[PDB]
Swiss-Prot record, chain A:
The gene is rpsT. InterPro entries: Ribosomal_bS20 (IPR002583), Ribosomal_bS20_sf (IPR036510). Transmembrane segments: none annotated. Residues 6-20 have a biased composition (Basic residues). It comes from Acinetobacter baumannii (strain AB0057). Residues 1-20 are annotated as: Disordered. This is Small ribosomal subunit protein bS20.
Swiss-Prot record, chain B:
Belongs to the universal ribosomal protein uS17 family. Pfam families: Ribosomal_S17. Part of the 30S ribosomal subunit. Keywords: Ribonucleoprotein, Ribosomal protein, RNA-binding, rRNA-binding. It comes from the Bacteria. HAMAP family: Ribosomal_uS17_B. GO terms for biological process: translation. GO terms for molecular function: rRNA binding; structural constituent of ribosome. This is Small ribosomal subunit protein uS17. One of the primary rRNA binding proteins, it binds specifically to the 5'-end of 16S ribosomal RNA.
UniProtKB/Swiss-Prot annotation, chain C:
Belongs to the universal ribosomal protein uS4 family. PROSITE patterns: RIBOSOMAL_S4 (PS00632), S4 (PS50889). Residues 97-159 form the S4 RNA-binding domain. The gene is rpsD. This is Small ribosomal subunit protein uS4. One of its GO terms (biological process) is translation. One of its GO terms (cellular component) is small ribosomal subunit. PANTHER family: 30S 40S RIBOSOMAL PROTEIN (PTHR11831), SMALL RIBOSOMAL SUBUNIT PROTEIN US4M (PTHR11831:SF4). It comes from Acinetobacter baumannii (strain AB0057). Part of the 30S ribosomal subunit. Contacts protein S5. The interaction surface between S4 and S5 is involved in control of translational fidelity. SMART domains: Ribosomal_S4 (SM01390), S4 (SM00363).
RNA sequence: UAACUGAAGAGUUUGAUCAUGGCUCAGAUUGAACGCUGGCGGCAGGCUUAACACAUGCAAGUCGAGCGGGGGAAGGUAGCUUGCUACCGGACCUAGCGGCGGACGGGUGAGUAAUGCUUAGGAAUCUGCCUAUUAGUGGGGGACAACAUCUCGAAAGGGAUGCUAAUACCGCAUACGUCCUACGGGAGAAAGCAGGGGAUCUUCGGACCUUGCGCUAAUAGAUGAGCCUAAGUCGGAUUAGCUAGUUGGUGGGGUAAAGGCCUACCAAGGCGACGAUCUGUAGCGGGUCUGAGAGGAUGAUCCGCCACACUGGGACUGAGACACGGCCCAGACUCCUACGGGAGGCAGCAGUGGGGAAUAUUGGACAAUGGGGGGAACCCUGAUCCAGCCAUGCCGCGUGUGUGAAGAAGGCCUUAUGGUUGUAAAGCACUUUAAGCGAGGAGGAGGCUACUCUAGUUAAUACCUAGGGAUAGUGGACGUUACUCGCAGAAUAAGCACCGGCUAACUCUGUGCCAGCAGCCGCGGUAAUACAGAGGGUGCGAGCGUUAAUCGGAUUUACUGGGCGUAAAGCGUGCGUAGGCGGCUUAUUAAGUCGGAUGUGAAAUCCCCGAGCUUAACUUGGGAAUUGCAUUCGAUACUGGUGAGCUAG
């Protein structure tokens, strides 16, 4: 970077990248937990996992980490696959 | 209020899909003689009602697959 | 650029008086060499010419009297062709509408060169303002006057006296006492001399 | 944002402005949405100095277009004149 | 009113001739170059070649009214070596955190024959700042730069320990809208700062009231962008078969959003002689040049779209980038060095080297129009507005005007005395454009500040916002502006090509198939109007010629608009595939064909009538035009489709 403001932008970019990566990995982890419960096949266990996963997805969607359309898609599809377990 | 075309089916092998051949007659830009041109359109046909040789109508729609963006309306004439 | 030099050979080459001198002395007594081209190989008037020679010689005669060069004359022809009407009479009207020629026909200059110098040296006012362009197109109902410092010029007095010998055009109403005049309308073809043939010029420029 | 501003044309030392509605990111003399008048700060004789279409001006202002300072002053002057 | 009105031939094959057929010429045009020459102004244009390599300066900042530190000026109080010290409250500045901007503006045409462009439509999307409307903005916590200490390095810059503020960050609470839903329910935000103040209190320094700028959730509008379809968009068959995520489907994943976009299975499909695949070339359009038109050539300068940023592969931040002056990785190259360690990408502006026939200054200002930041004051802006250089183009002007013959001199020719240069020259009388010197002087500046008044908002006359008035200040880089008025004196200002025919303009010397000329036919071998000089003349004129290139003439690829017995040209002859075309009557359809309406066909450009430039170039108002495309409604003679019938093929 040639200018001072460009250097500052690069520094802020690195810091924001680390922070966002942490927040996004959290959502991925919760979705993986719900998927594991569904594959396990116990309806109550899958319901509990989904109930834990939904607030994290919504909180990170409100922060701009992921789009709210993506959050809605995840919630709807996971709820359908949980309901499939009857 | 939706663009539509009428053609003849030349293939029905694919699942829920047909290939309809559209024919048009235009004037040659320089020599003036009337010529005929052909275009092949893949169309969506949900219930596989169409067969080879019938005359069908197809209307424009949103993409269904990589090559299909038209959908069957009705079979005007049957083979 | 404007042609500077001998005018008598120019008149001799075309074979007619080009009105390039004041006129106190007639052409024959002024030159004594009419009917002879300026060259040593100069011949009589009866020499045959091609059609290209005749068309060219007519255009050069038309240009020389008004003092217009080839570029401006070609632009004049191109404008006349665009304007609806007779092309030749349109070109003649455009030539007769130049400010210097109007000043000359008003009798403020003994020659068109004198009129051009008067116009260029800011001695002439058009509609109340001092101009210095000889090619300004004069329109109907215009007013051309002599500037205050320009007045009391013996050249101007001699010019008006000499013009009195000639006939004042119909389209020009001039008060010599106040050194003022009004261009009223473009001259018609009948007012202009009939020795000028314009079909040759139109053919030459339209080939 | 959408702005109403002056695009320059004419000759050197003799500017002539078209009053245009455009996205502000576009180049000054480039892409525009709609032209609604002109301004000639050096008009002489019979030449018109300022023509503004008040209906289109009001319509575009009602949708969020922001006039520049010069255009706002010209609109006020035109309304005062008429 | 008007918007168009348009078509020419010549030379050359032969002892003549007619035809065929090439070659050549007369025109228009240019981002031109070269040769000779060169006064001024206005308006434009200016690396077409190496997307070759780049020294140096500038081209992206701004906000202290988001935040904590840290600096240096003054003032006042105190003391006293007495105008020096030590303290104290206000005014300024900014390295760091943070916000917004940096995705615009500017450059270039390498790649790209269709993921692009043009025309006309479509559905499954997101969209900062702006406008309208709705509901809110409660209460907590843990950190990290700065800073302090240590350490590495000449430095440039690196590394490590301990603190700290916020509109930085994260829980909790609440939710008109919003998301999911099995219709039962479940889930998810935010931040403060500033101006003014009546009453009241003030746990003592603010609360509270009010007005702005902010922040959160959401719905519309506007803007911008993403996606899809149809028809068009350069050659090659001495390139004929191409394709396995390939073509379609299902479950799942993925995206802002449709979709083989990805993945696992199922099936064997999909494209191609209407040119697939492969290959050469190329940014596309509005437009520009030429042409009577149809066509042909072209895609500088202006506008729209696309693509690229030393060469390739990626992602981050963000509303928006796979980002010219940002990051990571690989490659080539270049620079500094104390050898420890570092740095870079002019196809931004100016400029350098190189290449080339050839294309400019390492300039001024943000005054105007815009762009970024800010509440404002104001700061930034090689965009832009200007200036410099170049006859590169277009347009305009000047280099003087009149008179002047028993026709001076000199030159060129000669029948040797005339002719010509020529009114030309001299002489005589006048004028002062432009350039030069002096004086005056618009417009490009709308506004802003100060003063006063009016109206909203409030508890308020304060503050804020919107208006009115007169007056005064202040604000122009161009700039010694345009323009106007005076002074001096013809004073400062003409070249280039050509004269055998095509093609306007002719002789004399010099040379003798030599020297030379030449676009074609051809000239020159002792009287050369064709070579060189001179005189004379012709055409142009601050220009004149040559070379290069496009269209025309060329009906010389012939659609408009050509030919094939002997001039070039009928396959050696049949059969037959695709295709082209096809007898008569009738009903029907409405694809071709024709008509109407509607929408669209950006602006600029071309044309017409006006307007302003002293005229013109040029600028500009309004029209006309954009011959096209799409939708819809009609007509049925002809062609096509379908049904029926007939017999001349
Ligand atoms: N890493 C990015 C480089 C990627 C590039 N594709 C490879 C490249 O350029 N390698 C060179 C190379 O190794 C060597 O140079 C020669 N000539 O051998 C070296 C000398 O120091 O410099 C490196 N270049 C460098 N560029 C960098 C710079 O500016 N700062 C930081 C440091 O990365 C510097 N080194």
């Amino acid at each position: 970077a040639n200018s001072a403001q460009a250097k500052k932008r690069a520094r802020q970019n690195v810091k924001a990248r680390k922070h966002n990566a942490s927040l996004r990995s959290m959502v991925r982890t919760y979705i993986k937990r719900t998927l594991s419960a569904i594959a396990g096949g116990d309806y109550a266990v899958a319901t509990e996992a989904y109930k834990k996963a939904v607030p994290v997805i919504d909180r990170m969607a409100d922060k701009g980490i992921i789009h709210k359309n993506k959050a809605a898609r995840h919630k709807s599809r996971l709820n359908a696959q949980v309901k499939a377990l009857a | 209020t939706v663009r539509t075309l009428t053609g003849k089916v030349v293939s029905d092998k694919m699942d829920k899909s047909i290939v309809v051949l559209i024919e048009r007659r235009v004037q040659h830009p320089l020599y003036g003689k009337s010529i005929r041109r052909s275009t092949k359109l893949h169309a969506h046909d949900e219930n596989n009602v169409a067969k080879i040789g019938d005359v069908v109508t197809i209307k424009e729609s949103r993409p269904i697959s990589k090559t299909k963006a038209w959908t069957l309306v009705e079979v005007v004439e049957a083979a | 650029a404007r042609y500077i030099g001998p005018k008598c050979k120019l008149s001799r080459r075309e074979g007619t008086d080009l009105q390039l001198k004041s006129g106190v002395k007639p052409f024959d007594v002024k030159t004594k060499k009419a009917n002879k081209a300026p060259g040593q190989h100069g011949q009589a008037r009866g020499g045959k010419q091609s059609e290209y020679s005749l068309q060219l010689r007519e255009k050069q005669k038309v240009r020389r009297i008004y003092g217009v060069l080839e570029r401006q004359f070609s632009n004049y022809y191109k404008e006349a062709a665009r304007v609806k009407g007779a092309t030749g009479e349109n070109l003649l009207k455009l030539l007769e509408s130049r400010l210097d020629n109007v000043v000359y026909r008003m009798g403020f200059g003994s020659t068109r060169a004198e009129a051009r110098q008067l116009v260029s040296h800011r001695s002439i006012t058009l509609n109340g303002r001092r101009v210095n362009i000889a090619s300004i197109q004069v329109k109907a109902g215009d007013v051309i006057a002599v500037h205050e410092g320009a007045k009391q010029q013996l050249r101007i007095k001699n010019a008006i006296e000499l013009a009195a010998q000639r006939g004042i055009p119909a389209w020009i109403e001039v008060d010599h006492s106040k050194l003022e005049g009004t261009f009223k309308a473009a001259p018609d073809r009948s007012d202009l001399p009939a020795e000028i043939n314009e079909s040759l010029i139109v053919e030459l420029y339209s080939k | 944002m959408v702005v109403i501003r002056l695009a320059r044309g004419g000759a050197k030392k003799r500017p002539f402005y078209q009053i245009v509605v455009t996205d502000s990111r576009n180049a000054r003399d480039g892409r525009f949405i709609e032209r609604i008048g002109f301004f000639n700060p050096t008009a002489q004789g019979q030449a018109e100095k300022l023509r503004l279409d008040a209906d289109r001006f009001a319509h575009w202002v009602s949708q969020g277009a922001q006039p520049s300072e010069r255009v706002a002053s010209l609109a006020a002057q035109a309304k005062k004149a008429t």
